[PDB]
C-alpha cells in the first residue's frame, strides 16, 4: 500500500485544457442549459 | 475496466456550475482565493485526524493530504485550467518571474480547482503502474475527503470544457 505522496512522481500528468467527461456529467450539463 | 470513484451528485453539480460560469458566462475566479487549497487540506487533516484511533491511520491521512497538495501543484497549470483561465495563469507566472518568487498553486487557487483535480484523478490512476491495494486506498481516502467536502459545501462553494467521448 503506497500513499499518494509516494506515488506523486509515478502518476503522469497530462498537458491539456481541462474538461468534464460526458459520460459522468452530461446529464447535469444538459440540465444546466435549461436554467 | 473503470476506476470507480464515487463523487456525490451535489459536488458533480458544483463542477458543472463552475463549468457554466467559466466557459459560458466568461467569468474567472478572483485570485488569490480567500480559502486556498492549502487551507482546505489543512483544515481537513486537522479535523479528521481527531477521529482516527490507529497511529497508521494518522500517517496515511497526512501522506494523503501532503501528496494531494504536491499533485495539485503539478497538475494545476498543466491540466486543470479552462482555456479562458490561461491568461490569468500566464500573468501569475509573469509576476512570479518578476518578483523572483516561485508560483505555488495551492497558495493561490481554491476549493473548486481542488475538486477539478479530483474529477480527473480516476483517469490519471487508470494509466499508472501501481499496486491494486495502493489504488484502493487512494480511492478510499479521496471518497472520504469528498464526503467531508460535501459536508462543507456551503462553506466552500467560444465553446470548451466538455469531452463528448469520455
Residue numbers in the entry:
A (entry chain D): 108 to 142
B (entry chain A): 218 to 374, 393 to 401
Paper text:
In Saccharomyces cerevisiae, reduced potassium dependency-3 (Rpd3) resides in two distinct histone deacetylase complexes, termed Rpd3S and Rpd3L1–3. The Rpd3S complex functions to repress transcriptional initiation within the coding region of genes during RNA polymerase II elongation by maintaining hypoacetylation. Rco1 recognizes unmodified H3K4 (H3K4me0) via its PHD1 domain and associates with Eaf3 to enhance the Eaf3–H3K36me3 interaction. In this study, we presented the structures of Eaf3MRG bound with Rco1PHD1–SID and H3K4me0 or with a fragment of Eaf7.
To address these unknowns, we identified a region within Eaf7 (aa 108–143) as the Eaf3MRG binding motif using GST pull-down assays and solved the structure of Eaf3MRG bound with Eaf7108–143 at a resolution of 2.40 Å. Residues 111–142 of Eaf7 are visible in the complex and adopt two helices (α1 and α2) connected by a long linker. Eaf7108–143 binds to Eaf3MRG mainly via hydrophobic interactions. α1 of Eaf7108–143 interacts with α3, α5 and α6 of Eaf3MRG mainly via hydrophobic interactions; the linker region of Eaf7 interacts with α3, α4, and α5 of Eaf3MRG via hydrophobic and hydrogen bonding interactions; α2 of Eaf7108–143 packs against α1 of Eaf3MRG. The main chain carbonyl group of Eaf7 Glu131 is hydrogen-bonded to Eaf3 Lys229, which forms an additional polar interaction with the side chain of Glu131. Consistently, mutagenesis and GST pull-down assays showed that L114A, I118A, R121A, D124A, and E131A of Eaf7108–143 slightly reduce the binding to Eaf3MRG, while F125A and L127A of Eaf7108–143 abolish the binding. In addition, R300A/R303E, V233E/W236D, and V233E/T240A of Eaf3MRG disrupt the binding to Eaf7108–143, suggesting that Eaf7108–143 and Rco1SID1–PHD bind to the same site on Eaf3MRG. Furthermore, ITC binding assay showed that SUMO–Eaf7108–143 binds to Eaf3MRG with a KD value of 1.0 μM but displays no binding toward the Eaf3MRG–Rco1PHD1–SID complex. Taken together, the structural analysis and binding data confirm that Eaf7108–143 and Rco1PHD1–SID bind to the same surface of Eaf3MRG. All MRG-binding ligands contain a common helix–linker–helix motif, such as α3–α4 of Rco1, α1–α2 of Eaf7, and α2–α3 of MRGBP. In addition, the solved structures confirm that Eaf7 and Rco1 bind to the same surface on Eaf3MRG, which complements our understanding of how Eaf3 resides in distinct histone modification complexes.
